[PDB]
Symmetry: D2
Subunit: 390 residues, 4 copies
């Protein structure tokens, strides 16, 4: 009766459509993505085609209704993220950005003109987007951003000056969703396009996490943005923070995919690998580790399902997402690390993949809110007292 691959029977909680979506995508991930990841991660190569392929599959911005989007459930989105990360976090990162940080904001805060113009191309993967929020001196604290947008009443345009750093996709992006503080004090979102004079996106080197993902900066040297390129629905941090919650939800699901991959790899290895005349799996010390991995993965999976259902009922609060994002990323990191220890020397070889996941989850536990920041977010909600600053 017990199936270690699905202890609490998540399967019977999914709809036929969700199950169908998951399996279909899984096939694509295993057939087209797994075979390119080894060298991609080793030589820091991101295949632009990947976005086009996922575009044809209609996986980009799946929860969006209309504009060429699937219009599927939040749970389906979570299931998609899990299958992508089961392969690699870098790949899932590229998809999170396109879906939740680029398409979503244009959909929720954009004008109908902007939706009509960008969504269809983004959905089909014709345009690669990026989300510019973080800056050299503004990470956990967005109120410290220095990127400014000055209004030109005569030209009915804005002039942007600033630097965004650690931006996923920027080096090969076509559309840039940038957040800058305005003269009125409010921070707004601007749509920039490659080619605009004064806009640069150099690549960041020396990464030892999310190597199969393109990461760069966004340097704006007096970039002039037409008024029509401004997002009319966002005013102050609420716009970005809102988008952030959608990306974080996808992340809470995704890391479970990476964990499951690590669990499966460690398990099979423990059964195949022999020392002292028996398989490693025969040892108590080894079995306890496997039990811990399965336990944490399971608790996170069913919690994510619940959040996904609440989300579709418009009953999901940002704190809920922080709770699972923080929990799953932290737990996922520990799992990948244990798995690495379990494969011994072979574990430091990327040929065995676990080392790649352990490295990748390092970055995942940091971006979209650090583990400690999310704790403080929960702390504020629990006590009603803010403790970020002094």
């Amino acid at each position: 009766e017990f199936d270690w691959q699905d202890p609490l029977v998540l399967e019977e909680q999914l709809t036929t459509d969700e199950i169908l979506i998951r399996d279909t995508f899984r096939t694509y991930c295993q057939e087209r993505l797994m075979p390119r990841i080894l060298l991609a991660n080793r030589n820091e190569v991101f295949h632009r085609e990947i976005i086009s392929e996922m575009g044809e599959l209609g996986v980009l911005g799946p929860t969006i209704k209309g504009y060429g989007c699937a219009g599927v459930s939040s749970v389906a989105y979570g299931l998609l993220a899990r299958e992508l990360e089961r392969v690699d976090s870098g790949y899932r990162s590229a998809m999170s950005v396109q879906s939740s940080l680029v398409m979503h904001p244009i959909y929720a805060y954009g004008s109908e003109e902007q939706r009509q113009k960008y969504l269809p191309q983004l959905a089909k993967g014709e345009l690669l987007g990026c989300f510019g929020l973080t800056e050299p001196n503004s990470g956990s604290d967005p109120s410290s951003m220095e990127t400014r947008a000055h209004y030109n009443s005569s030209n009915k345009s804005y002039t942007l000056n600033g630097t965004k750093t650690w931006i996923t996709n920027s080096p090969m992006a076509d559309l840039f969703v940038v957040w800058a503080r305005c003269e009125d004090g409010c921070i707004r979102g601007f749509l920039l396009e490659k080619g605009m004079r004064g806009l640069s996106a150099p690549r960041i080197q020396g990464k030892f996490s999310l190597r199969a993902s393109a990461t760069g900066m966004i340097i704006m040297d007096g970039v002039e943005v037409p008024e029509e390129n401004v997002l009319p629905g966002a005013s102050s941090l609420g716009g970005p923070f809102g988008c952030l919650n959608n990306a974080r939800y996808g992340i809470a699901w995704g890391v479970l995919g990476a964990s499951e991959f690590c669990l499966h790899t460690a398990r099979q290895y423990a059964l195949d690998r022999m020392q002292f005349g028996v398989p490693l799996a025969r040892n108590q010390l080894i079995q306890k580790k496997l039990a811990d991995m399965l336990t944490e993965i399971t608790l996170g999976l069913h919690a994510c399902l619940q959040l996904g259902r609440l989300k579709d009922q418009d009953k999901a609060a940002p704190e809920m997402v922080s709770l699972l994002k923080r929990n799953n990323c932290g737990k996922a990191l520990d799992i990948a690390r244990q798995a690495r220890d379990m494969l011994g020397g072979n574990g430091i070889s990327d040929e065995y993949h676990v080392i790649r996941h352990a490295m990748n989850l390092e970055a995942v536990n940091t971006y979209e809110g650090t583990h400690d920041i999310h704790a403080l977010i929960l702390g504020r909600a629990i006590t009603g007292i803010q403790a970020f600053t002094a």
Copy 2:
């Protein structure tokens, strides 16, 4: 939108009946049990009346259909356990025994005569029962039990000899469900009654955990048991192990009640207690602890709900129960310990209750399968390889 008392909205997952049952019982627990626990735990006093009271409420053996039992869902049973333990583990222990270790076996493995005869009295709390499995040299390993039952073909009866130890309720029990190895090699269950010649149940002293619970031994000096007092439905360890899973399920839910109590107490204390001119809740170190407690409690609550639903569909496997029992008891223990540290000096006073829960959860994490035994149970299920012995 966010309610820290129910982060993922468990409430909307419960039926009106379940909610009604929970609240009704909660009222009883807060009005009748909380007021007696301070001194009960301090002076090791178990109020026999408690079983009668719960009997009138019809909370005893709630999942049983007929025989004067409520016939409620597994989730309802879990909800009941949670409210009882929110008060004290010792109290919930007395109820777990009566319901899952005494009534359940008589219901599933007993003859119709035994059901008709015992269930109604047990349901109303007229009879206090106990479950005798563990022995001085047989704890984590039941195959080592030395209690033997010899058959008397002439009298059509059995003669039992042995010692059961660390038995909840034994000192004031009326009915004893004892497990002994038979001459044929199979271990069977026998129903003994206070008064039988050769049967003794002395109390155990020096307990510093579950003090409000009566704990003793069961000494059998050639006790003669009529054949009709044997449970015809059990043959070898499967009978007790089966019952054990039902008790463990209730335990997985219960410890969450104790955790929630500790969380609420620590939280309120952090808000009321002031040092350095501000409430303790203002400190980052304090807020992280609260965030961790809420996180673990939440993951366990929704996992338990899922298990409860599967259980009512007859799709629950023993491994599922081990996973949650091990997880929730371990996590609950850490939570009570953190809470104790958070109340400082006052935390070692039973007047603040947290110290009582921390002590109680010590025993809970040990009985009904130790934390490590459950890991091995999961390990066997995951690898297909047994690692209990060498």
Copy 3:
């Protein structure tokens, strides 16, 4: 070559005198203290005689030179604390107070008259002292104390008003060293004596930690203190904090005694206790725990030795003591908890002693600076930035 009872050979680091002192005291502790601890802890009984006995042995205020004191090394003091706590923390607490919190301050900040008058009696155990610093609203933050001392220029005396709580020895104390804020803003130390009008010391009930220790309050209802009873060498928090470091040093050593006791008990139990046809010690899960316990104990022992040597050279800084106090108390707590889990059901019985140590170490990790406060103390020293307040 390897001796698990002393992995890094601490023995060859001790002087013949230190070794002699340790063994002599050990004999007393095992012969006179161990036999009374079971019931003492169970019924909350502190034997006043214990202080007289240690007085005859000359163990009280051992580092003090003259006044009938041994005048031994700091390491000897640490060794003494370790042997006392190997028996019980409550007992070591009574000795820490007498030696470091009562005798030391009178020795360092007192007038020659006060030394001549009190030290000899305290050294011989004729007088039982206590240290009154903590108050209901002043624990981790001493600047919040409300006990005030008003000067009476005419009578050349002070009038004290306030309440000290959670004070070790107060219910049966003869001498009270109380700290109160003065009209000039500075906090001074006053010597009070039982019998003074307005002075009350009721006992605290409901303790589930350090039960063999007498703990009470110090209520001062307009107590008049002669000027000669004021400690001329202390002015503001430096006096108490200075004394505190001496007590904390003894604590860092002591908890290692309790840990060693828990390690030895768990080890022997694992060898004697059999399940699954072999001793528990045969299991990998069990052996890892023992390895962890030995490792932490060893690291702490040699660190304490080093601190002790520096101390005698007047090169010990308060931060050094915080580091070891915080480390050893935290680690000791984990060790006792693991040991308790290792003895299973029997572990919750005080007959097996481990449960007593686990409970006791709860209080030890809280008093003389909480685990988190000491972290902040280290944090300030490392960064040069204070983070206690906001």
Copy 4:
């Protein structure tokens, strides 16, 4: 008085020579090694010159007396390892191999001819050596090695067949110390030299740990070894295990260097980096982490000193080394991981170095005995019962 860079004043425990040695080497490491590590690690480049340079400095095989070796203390050796690893584990690995796994065995188990012939060249870095013990199917269990050596009575030589894997330095080694099982059942050590027919040493690719170190295999296709190339002092596992303890001792010290580097980097970063209008160092959550790092580093440093002193007195047992190797490597890993989390996004860049140490320590915690194997080694010593196998 308190200096966070040396809490317990290790400095006053070192001799003038040891201090002189440390500082002299430190200068070399910071001036010649630090500047090459960034790209070395990034592009997997090991500079052969490094061994020549350390050879001129006389740091190779420092504890050896004569043969052109320094003949310094064990503590000096530890101090050297700490300064090397403060730069990079890969670099220290190359030195550990040359000193403890190549020079030491030739010194202790070799013939005078072999010493005269190899030591002088190894000491000056003229020859690069490697230690071949591990095989594809023989890691934690050496008794499973398949490399065999057949004796040729006629030629008075041996023929070796087998494969060694994960061997540090092999791809550019001149001398190979290989261990093979003989026909008599005993395993002996053979000295091979590059150029011998049938000997191959291909490089291993895909490493994501110790990248600045050359790692390869040793394939022996019927390699013929003269009798004079056999180590006359080793017979069965004792030879390699003996050498292993010397390398492990150096490792226990070394990882503390990497930890200190991570602590210093995280600390400075916390002081320079600002968010929410204050330096990160102002936050409680940040300060606790720093306190933990300093605590563990300190406990390990003084324990290592003690072991080093015992070693020079020939009183060091293998278990002592396991205890510190296991402890320091495990703790060092946690420290590097925390530091990485503390630098946020920048932490995944090798430009900030912490990510390199975290990756490197992964391998260090695995080789020379895994964390769990060392636990079992301690477990056997503590209980007298072996638990490696079943």
